[PDB]
Design a protein around this ligand. Structure first.
Ligand SMILES: O=C(O)c1ccnc(-n2nccc2-c2cccc(O)c2)c1
Ligand code: NI
Ligand SMILES: [Zn+2]
Length: 345
């Protein structure tokens, strides 16, 4: 529970360290960041992915979703109602209005209590999964739109576009909008940058304890678990930090403020909520460590699947026959950093 090996680390790279994305990820894994499932990276003060955000009031959010939550005793299920399209302007009006705005709070822990006490009431609207990017064309460091990781093999060799995985998504938040407990698609890494506005709070379970979270949820949602062997992948399940403490799931929390990146690691369960009107940009990425997580990922069996053949042939040609036949049973040690990190010791 308390073990700092599994606690969320924050990093403050210099501009020189920053310019190389894949290398900095390898560095933060050399320092154990991946054990927590989530890390924060504050960029160098000077760096700026856009001049300013005054000029986006006419951006269209095609499919805003109202987030209806049902439940009690810290277990909840989140349903989506697609609303018809609206602009950033229309969205900010609702968000900053008096029916939807951030309540009064002295500190994080007060706002958290109000979140878990009030998430079933007063359903907010989330401008989620908007295709696009808010970086200017000219930004070369940590550009969510083009990160140059090996994930690029899906598009380059397989010729496949997957929206929000291979491509960036924007998220327009408002108080009490939520992301439920999940790992990424195919258990990829993710990157999330908060462009502006109020903060985003995150909960994280270390990858070494993720199966504990799955067994908690199977047990609390037996119906869901019979229908689909990865029902968390549906992104409808909210579980409170008080339930996690109560059943001995270790977890950590952290708050992302405007201008910060969050990195999620393979098989890092995460959830959270936005404090008020904000905008984030995110996509998935991979390292060589990801490949084993990809091969082994348990997928939604009832409704994103990436073909691993390209990755195994390119990076594990020795193991390919064995893997195709069903014989490869490498076991993942979640503690080990990516091979790319050998240069740091
Ligand atoms: O909306 C977020 O702030 C957020 C944060 C972290 N991860 C997610 N992810 N990651 C993959 C897919 C989602 C996602 C996307 C849309 C709604 C949702 O509840 C979750 C979304
Ligand atoms: Ni995520
Ligand atoms: Zn399913």
């Amino acid at each position: 529970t308390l073990n700092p090996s599994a606690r969320i680390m924050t990093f403050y790279p210099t501009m020189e360290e920053f310019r190389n994305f894949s290398r900095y990820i390898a560095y933060i894994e050399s320092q154990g960041a991946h054990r927590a499932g989530l890390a924060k990276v504050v960029p160098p003060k000077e760096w700026k992915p856009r001049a300013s955000y005054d000029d986006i009031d006419d951006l269209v959010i095609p499919a805003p979703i109202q987030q209806l939550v049902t439940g009690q005793s810290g277990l909840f299920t989140q349903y989506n109602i697609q609303k018809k399209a609206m602009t950033v302007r229309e969205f900010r009006k609702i968000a900053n209005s008096d029916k939807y705005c951030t309540p009064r709070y002295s500190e994080f822990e007060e706002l958290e209590r109000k979140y878990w006490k009030n998430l079933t009431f007063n359903p907010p609207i989330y401008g989620a999964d908007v295709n696009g990017t808010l970086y200017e064309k000219h930004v070369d460091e940590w550009n969510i739109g083009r990160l140059r990781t090996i994930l690029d093999l899906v598009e380059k060799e397989s010729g496949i576009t997957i929206e929000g995985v291979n491509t960036p998504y924007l998220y327009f938040g408002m108080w009490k909008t939520s992301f439920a407990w999940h790992t990424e698609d195919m258990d990829l890494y993710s990157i999330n940058y908060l462009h502006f506005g109020e903060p985003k709070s995150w909960y994280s379970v270390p990858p070494e304890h993720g199966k504990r979270l799955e067994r908690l949820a199977k047990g609390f949602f037996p119906g869901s678990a019979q229908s689909c062997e990865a029902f968390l992948r549906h992104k409808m399940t909210l579980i409170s930090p008080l339930m996690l403490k109560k059943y001995g799931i270790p977890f950590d929390k952290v708050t992302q403020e405007a201008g910060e990146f969050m990195i999620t690691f393979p098989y890092g369960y995460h959830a959270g909520f936005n404090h008020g009107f904000n905008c984030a940009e995110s996509t998935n990425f991979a390292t060589r460590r990801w490949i084993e997580y990809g091969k082994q990922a348990v997928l939604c069996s009832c409704r994103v699947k990436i073909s691993m053949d390209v990755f195994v042939r390119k990076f594990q040609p020795e193991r390919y026959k064995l893997w195709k036949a069903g014989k490869d049973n490498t076991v993942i040690d979640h503690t080990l950093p990516t091979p790319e990190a050998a240069e740091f010791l």
